[PDB]
């Protein structure tokens, strides 16, 4: 990669990967393709980044929320429930650990496994509350791609958080564990179950 | 003397208020319209605005 060194020296692994390929903590942004129709344009993956910490303005326009790198979107949803509001450096680190753990098990790309877990837990159709007067039935509706991504992330993180509460396992482990099972849904994961049953309920009313 | 600049400017403001009051009570039948004070070397100057200055 044609090394070069100046007064204050920049390290090898630092020099090497950075100017070669623009990639994660260290992980490949290339490959990593969304295996489902739609769900593309709503999952970021190129443009590539270094860490999941970015100060963007994603909130001031309706759909621009989707242009955020989806790894970072996964992290943002990690910091919540009171005490953990803010505290992204915490979260950023947890993701880094999580990715490494996911990579150890069943190889591939941990950033790809993330993409798998997202696409698989998004409900295709759902129900809402339509009054009709008095006792209200439930109307089936087909949920958007955007909500499909959001709810996928929210479902994944929550289930991991609750599974990481009051037990020896850490967040990164359970977070990984969830994503792994949610790669191809094993129905052993909090997220998949909730997805399937949202389409189970949406099926019985139709 | 020897005052803070902050306390000094405030103190002067309070001085105007109390002075302004005393005239508004005292000079009422002279048509007291309000005052202004000019701080100079050697003197403090107080100008009485009144429609009727012959009684003042």
């Amino acid at each position: 990669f044609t090394p070069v060194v100046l007064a204050t020296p920049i390290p090898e692994e630092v020099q090497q990967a950075q100017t070669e390929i623009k990639l994660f903590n260290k992980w490949s942004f290339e490959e990593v393709e969304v295996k489902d129709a739609s769900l593309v344009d709503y999952v970021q993956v190129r443009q590539p980044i270094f860490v999941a910490h970015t100060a963007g303005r994603y909130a001031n326009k309706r759909f621009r929320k989707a242009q955020c790198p989806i790894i970072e979107r996964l992290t943002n949803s990690l910091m919540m429930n009171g005490r953990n509001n803010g505290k992204k450096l915490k979260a950023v680190r947890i993701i880094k650990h999580t990715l490494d753990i996911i990579n150890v098990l069943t190889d591939q790309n941990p950033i790809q496994v993330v993409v798998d877990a997202i696409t698989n837990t998004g409900p295709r159709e759902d129900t809402t509350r339509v009054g009709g007067g008095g006792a209200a039935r439930r109307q089936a509706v087909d949920v958007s791609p955007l909500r499909r991504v959001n709810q996928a992330i929210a479902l994944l993180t929550i289930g991991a958080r609750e599974a990481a509460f009051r037990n020896i396992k850490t967040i990164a482990e359970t977070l990984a564990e969830e994503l792994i099972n949610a790669a191809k849904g094993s129905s052993t994961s909090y997220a998949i179950k909730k997805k399937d049953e949202l389409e189970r309920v949406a099926k019985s009313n139709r | 003397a020897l005052i803070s600049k902050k306390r000094k400017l405030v103190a002067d403001g309070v001085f105007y208020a109390e002075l302004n009051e005393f005239f508004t009570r005292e000079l009422a039948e002279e048509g007291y319209s309000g005052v202004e004070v000019r701080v100079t070397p050697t003197k403090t100057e107080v100008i009485i605005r009144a429609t009727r200055t012959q009684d003042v």
Binding site: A37, S38, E125, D142, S144, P145, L146, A202 | -
Partner: protein, 63 residues
């Protein structure tokens, strides 16, 4: 499972009493030239892609 893919043609408007539901006309990418109007859940713009878990059905007004 007979999965069916459809692209959003148009944004018709908001249904539902609360109003968090949108009426949308779509075109399937596999075997085009037919359009059905579907009720969505989340936020939607034109050229999105809705996965219709059952190919032939539709709805109009909600309460």
């Amino acid at each position: 499972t007979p999965v069916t893919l459809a692209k959003v043609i148009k944004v018709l408007g908001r249904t539902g009493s609360r109003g968090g539901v949108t009426q949308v006309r779509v075109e399937f990418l596999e075997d085009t030239s037919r359009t059905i109007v579907r009720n969505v859940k989340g936020p939607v713009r034109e050229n999105d892609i809705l996965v219709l878990m059952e190919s032939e059905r539709e709805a109009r007004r909600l309460r």
